[PDB]
């Protein structure tokens, strides 16, 4: 009845024509409107072999969000720095005639191997193309416990996506040092999750003891929490987030440094490019850390324990974080 296949999908959105936002104005063309009554079909007695790490849907999402950045986020070298509205909208990816999408419903399913509660969806849920490092922001959420995605965990070389089962917030601001900013998180709450994490990593790590530390070294973007708020790139120090000890007898809130930045490293092409002075109004993106991205030192083996430092940077992974339970297939 089917064989795996890749094919240029089509994209669907609630993008409102007129509103001058980037993601809207890019979706109102290239994307089609949204169905109000889409339908999920639970397939028969069915199990399918998924694999979130070799999924062509994430390479189409990937080239999508690129044709968005350099085109509606013009660089200050200057081609001219028009500044305009920027809040990602949810995009659905869909199948053209004669191909289907197989969704997975195993709640605690690492996006690889066999699934069993397979349904047929016409489109993927509303996914926002939210580019960041370290943390995965205002995304979806794991449905039961927490799930530890990775392509082969025994390889310290592989990025590790955790999908939180509980969502805790990040209030990220700058006032009206024209670049000082700061990100506000309720530590009470956020320490219980990472604790809850560690707990879930010990499952995957022979009850070995689990520690957290800043990234060992890299470009700022992946050494810090780089993200986009209304068109300004933030770079937050996170050291206060993977603080062990605080987890004992500790403290309440947390505040993060974060410095807005005009000069930055590209992730569309290869190179660099500056951006104008920001707006001296205020900026405040309240976001939901739905999942975090790390790398394992592992390097010892052994050493009695395992180390984990924040990561990200492969944005392909930001997508595989929400397109893991999908897979495309050809019919007749």
């Amino acid at each position, epitope marked *: 009845v089917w064989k795996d296949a890749d094919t*240029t999908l*089509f*994209c669907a959105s609630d993008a409102k024509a007129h509103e001058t936002e980037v993601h809207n104005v890019a979706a109102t063309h290239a994307c*089609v*409107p949204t169905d109000p009554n889409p339908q999920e079909i639970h397939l028969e007695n069915v199990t399918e072999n998924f694999n979130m790490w070799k999924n062509n849907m994430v390479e189409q999402m990937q080239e999508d969000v690129i044709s968005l950045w350099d085109q509606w986020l013009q660089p200050c070298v200057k081609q001219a720095c028009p500044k305009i509205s920027f809040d990602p909208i949810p995009i659905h990816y*869909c*199948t053209p*005639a004669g191909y289907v999408i197989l969704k997975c419903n195993d709640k605690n399913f690492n996006g690889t191997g066999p699934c069993k509660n397979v349904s047929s969806v016409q489109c993927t849920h509303g996914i926002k193309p939210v580019v960041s490092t370290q943390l995965l922001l205002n995304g979806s959420l794991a449905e039961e416990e927490i799930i530890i995605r990775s392509e082969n965990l025994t390889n310290n070389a592989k990025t590790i996506i955790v999908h939180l089962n509980k969502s805790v917030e990040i209030n990220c601001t700058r006032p009206s040092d024209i670049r000082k900013a700061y990100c506000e998180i309720n530590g009470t709450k956020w320490n219980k999750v990472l604790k809850q994490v560690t707990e879930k990593l010990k499952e995957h790590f022979n009850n070995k003891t689990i520690i957290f530390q800043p990234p060992s070294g890299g470009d700022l973007e992946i050494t810090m929490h780089s993200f986009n708020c209304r068109g300004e790139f933030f770079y937050c120090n996170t050291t206060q987030l993977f603080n062990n000890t605080c987890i004992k007898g500790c403290n309440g809130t947390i505040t993060l440094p974060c410095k807005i930045k005009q000069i930055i490293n590209m992730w569309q092409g290869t190179g660099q490019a500056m951006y104008a002075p920001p707006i001296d109004g205020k900026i405040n993106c309240v976001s939901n850390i739905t999942g975090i991205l790390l790398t394992r030192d592992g390097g010892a083996n052994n050493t009695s324990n395992e180390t984990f430092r924040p990561g990200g940077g492969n944005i392909k992974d930001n997508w595989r974080s929400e397109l893991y339970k999908y897979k495309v297939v050809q019919i007749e």
Partner: antibody, heavy 122, light 111 residues
Framework: EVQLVESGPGLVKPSQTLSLTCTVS??????????WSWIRQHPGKGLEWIGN???????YYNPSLKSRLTISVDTTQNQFSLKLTSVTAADTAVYYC??????????????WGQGTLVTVSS | QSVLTQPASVSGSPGQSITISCTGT?????????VSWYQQHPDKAPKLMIY???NRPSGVSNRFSGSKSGNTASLTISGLQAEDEADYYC??????????FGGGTKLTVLG
């Protein structure tokens, strides 16, 4: 696969209402991902574009005709029609049926119907 | 909706090569990667020749390329045969939220 055949009157009276229908076949019409367009070309003159309709409600028309133009989607959806009011001999054209469409881009009209001529005259 | 400006006619001898030009606004051809080309032939329907600026559907000859620079695109027949004599039409998506066509180009095979 994908055929497109136009049908409807070949003679409209001035002031009257012109009406045609595409019948998709090869189909479907609410599968993609696709748009369904109407286009005209007066004899010997050049191509003009009237409208597009997506399988849901949504229409996309030419602002030059927005005042006398409607498109819709009918029998089990499968087929879409044109309705052009207050005509004059200005609307004497070969009307065409055509599909676009917007996968992850590309807005271009393929699969064209050989076209039904329609003369406006009393 | 502008109206898109092509020549009224181009010309050239067999084996040769010529281009046809299509100019619109920064919001037409501008604008987007949604320029297409149509061949006519009397008295058939328009045939999709080039799409998304410079993409060619299967079953179209090898000698039709499409290009673009600024608000002007170009169709380039490369290896004129006496049977490409037809009308050509450039067309783009716009915004607006809609499509415009060029006025057409009767290309003629000299000799």
């Amino acid at each position: 696969e994908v055929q497109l055949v136009e049908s409807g009157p070949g003679l409209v009276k001035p002031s009257q209402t012109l009406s045609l229908t595409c019948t998709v076949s090869g189909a479907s019409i609410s599968s993609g991902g696709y748009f369904w367009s109407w286009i005209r070309q007066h004899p010997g003159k050049g191509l003009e574009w009237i409208g597009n309709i997506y399988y849901i409600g949504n229409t996309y028309y030419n602002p030059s005709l927005k005042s006398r133009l409607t498109i819709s989607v009918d029998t089990t959806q499968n087929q879409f029609s044109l309705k052009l009011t207050s005509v004059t001999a200005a609307d004497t054209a070969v009307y065409y049926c055509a599909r676009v469409p917007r996968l992850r881009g590309g807005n271009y009209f393929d699969s064209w119907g050989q076209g039904t001529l329609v003369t406006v005259s009393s | 909706q502008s109206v898109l400006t092509q020549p009224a006619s181009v010309s050239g001898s067999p084996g040769q090569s010529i281009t046809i030009s299509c100019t619109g606004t920064s919001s037409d051809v501008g604008g987007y990667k949604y320029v297409s080309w149509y061949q006519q032939h009397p008295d058939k329907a328009p045939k999709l020749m080039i799409y998304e600026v410079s993409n060619r559907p299967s079953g179209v000859s090898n000698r039709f390329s499409g290009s673009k620079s600024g608000n002007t695109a170009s169709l380039t027949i490369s290896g004129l045969q006496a049977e490409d004599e037809a009308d050509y039409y450039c067309s783009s998506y716009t915004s607006s939220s809609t499509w415009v066509f060029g006025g057409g180009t009767k290309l003629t095979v000299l000799g």
